[PDB]
């Protein structure tokens, strides 16, 4: 279809739409063994914000910035409201969505 499927023998599957979208399928053999921006796979969604330092935080920005590969990379800041910074698009967006 519109998807490119990367299949692995370890139980991990990837679907990529050749664009910003990516879907990662994990077998139930990796529960509690994974980490990163995708959570830790232990059926609990509130502790998925665990940082690289192994601490669950309430700030999404801090949890996301803790997972950057390069420590020298600048931290991400809070973005503006897309429909407030660009109101002239807002109507179209709604009419499109």
């Amino acid at each position: 279809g519109i998807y490119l499927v990367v299949d692995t023998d370890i139980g991990l599957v990837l679907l990529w739409d050749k664009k910003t979208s990516i879907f990662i399928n994990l077998s139930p053999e990796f529960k509690g063994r994974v980490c990163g921006l995708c959570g830790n796979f232990d059926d609990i969604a509130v502790n998925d914000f665990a940082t690289r330092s192994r601490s669950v935080v309430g700030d999404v920005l801090e949890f996301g910035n803790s997972w950057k590969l390069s420590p020298s990379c600048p931290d991400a800041l809070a973005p503006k409201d897309p429909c407030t910074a660009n109101p002239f698009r807002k109507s179209w967006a709604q009419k499109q969505c």
Binding site: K90, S91, W92, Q94, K95
Partner: protein
Amino acid sequence: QAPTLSRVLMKVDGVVIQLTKGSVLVNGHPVLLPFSQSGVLIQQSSSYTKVEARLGLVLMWNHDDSLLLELDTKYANKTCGLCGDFNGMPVVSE
């Protein structure tokens, strides 16, 4: 109160038009007629204020305090309000 018309509020594809006696506001900003923007044309004549929307509507606020709306036939069976559901049958569905 005479049964005068005080305010007419129009939402036309993201454009907000407020018509009051001696005032026309577009998106909260007073405008000078004729005013064309985003496919909406507002113009004042000796007897009426006309708002034409290219999506297919015409609104007339006359000086005898009459508000007349004319709609494109593509909106039939898809409207609601004091003007009915626009399906060609007077009583049913209203």
